[PDB]
Structure formats: C-alpha cells, structure tokens
Design an enzyme around this catalytic site. Sequence first.
Site, PDB file in Angstrom:
ATOM      1  N   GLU A  22      32.984   3.763   0.362  1.00 60.71           N
ATOM      2  CA  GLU A  22      33.649   3.977  -0.922  1.00 60.71           C
ATOM      3  C   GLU A  22      33.292   5.313  -1.552  1.00 60.71           C
ATOM      4  O   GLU A  22      32.168   5.802  -1.416  1.00 60.71           O
ATOM      5  CB  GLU A  22      33.339   2.842  -1.904  1.00 60.71           C
ATOM      6  CG  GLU A  22      31.870   2.648  -2.214  1.00 60.71           C
ATOM      7  CD  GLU A  22      31.594   2.534  -3.699  1.00 60.71           C
ATOM      8  OE1 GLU A  22      32.199   3.294  -4.488  1.00 60.71           O
ATOM      9  OE2 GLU A  22      30.755   1.697  -4.079  1.00 60.71           O
ATOM     10  N   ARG A  64      32.088   6.330 -13.960  1.00 59.34           N
ATOM     11  CA  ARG A  64      32.856   6.596 -12.750  1.00 59.34           C
ATOM     12  C   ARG A  64      34.265   6.008 -12.802  1.00 59.34           C
ATOM     13  O   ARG A  64      35.075   6.255 -11.900  1.00 59.34           O
ATOM     14  CB  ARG A  64      32.118   6.043 -11.534  1.00 59.34           C
ATOM     15  CG  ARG A  64      30.824   6.761 -11.200  1.00 59.34           C
ATOM     16  CD  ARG A  64      30.012   6.002 -10.159  1.00 59.34           C
ATOM     17  NE  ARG A  64      30.723   5.913  -8.886  1.00 59.34           N
ATOM     18  CZ  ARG A  64      30.594   4.921  -8.009  1.00 59.34           C
ATOM     19  NH1 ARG A  64      29.791   3.902  -8.253  1.00 59.34           N
ATOM     20  NH2 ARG A  64      31.296   4.943  -6.887  1.00 59.34           N
ATOM     21  N   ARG A 124      38.914   4.406  -6.816  1.00 64.45           N
ATOM     22  CA  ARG A 124      38.116   4.647  -5.619  1.00 64.45           C
ATOM     23  C   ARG A 124      39.018   4.848  -4.419  1.00 64.45           C
ATOM     24  O   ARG A 124      40.147   4.336  -4.376  1.00 64.45           O
ATOM     25  CB  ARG A 124      37.193   3.458  -5.306  1.00 64.45           C
ATOM     26  CG  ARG A 124      36.264   2.992  -6.416  1.00 64.45           C
ATOM     27  CD  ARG A 124      35.018   3.852  -6.502  1.00 64.45           C
ATOM     28  NE  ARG A 124      34.068   3.341  -7.489  1.00 64.45           N
ATOM     29  CZ  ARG A 124      34.142   3.557  -8.800  1.00 64.45           C
ATOM     30  NH1 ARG A 124      35.132   4.281  -9.313  1.00 64.45           N
ATOM     31  NH2 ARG A 124      33.212   3.053  -9.602  1.00 64.45           N
ATOM     32  N   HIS A 184      39.219  -0.853  -9.333  1.00 63.81           N
ATOM     33  CA  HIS A 184      37.894  -1.211  -8.842  1.00 63.81           C
ATOM     34  C   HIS A 184      37.889  -2.478  -7.995  1.00 63.81           C
ATOM     35  O   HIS A 184      37.137  -3.425  -8.251  1.00 63.81           O
ATOM     36  CB  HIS A 184      36.858  -1.276  -9.965  1.00 63.81           C
ATOM     37  CG  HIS A 184      35.463  -1.039  -9.486  1.00 63.81           C
ATOM     38  ND1 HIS A 184      34.548  -2.055  -9.332  1.00 63.81           N
ATOM     39  CD2 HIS A 184      34.843   0.092  -9.078  1.00 63.81           C
ATOM     40  CE1 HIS A 184      33.413  -1.555  -8.877  1.00 63.81           C
ATOM     41  NE2 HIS A 184      33.566  -0.255  -8.713  1.00 63.81           N
TER      42      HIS A 184
END
Length: 96
Positions: A54, A65, A69, A85
Amino acid sequence: DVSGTVCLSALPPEATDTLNLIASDGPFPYSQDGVVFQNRESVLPTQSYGYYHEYTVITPGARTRGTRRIITGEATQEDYYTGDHYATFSLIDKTC
C-alpha cells in the site's frame, strides 16, 4: 469485490505521482508507504501476505494521510485505487 476499472487520468493527479514513486522505489512522503497490505476483510482476491503493498495518494488540504491509496499486486499490471481507505477498490488502467 473489485469495483470495475478506472483510468489513471480520471484519478487525482497525486495518484500519478504515487505510481511514479512506486516505480522508482521512492522517495515516499509517509513512513507507512510500501507496507504490506493485509487485505484483512478479503475485499481483494485472496493472496498470501506480501502480495499486496500500500501507498498513500496525497489528498490536497488534508491533515492526515487521508483515505486515498494505491495497492500494488503482481508486477506492474495489477494496481488498485481506493478512494475510501479499503472499502472499495478499482483496477487502474495506466494507459488512459
């Protein structure tokens, strides 16, 4: 389940940045970038631990963050994007 396919051009520009960094082995902005993705809810196809890695896609304006991803799979042909996420993923087509 994998929710269809998405063109790289349709993702935020930061997703292109992330893919460029994945290919160059960094520099990654976050300490967690590159960690094995566990796929602990079995949303992606079942694979042995270490198959998936990831990487953060930076969210502009975020403090953390954020939730974007890229998850890499086999070689450079199986990159997934998640905007949420790990609730959903789409296979990235880097040619469009």
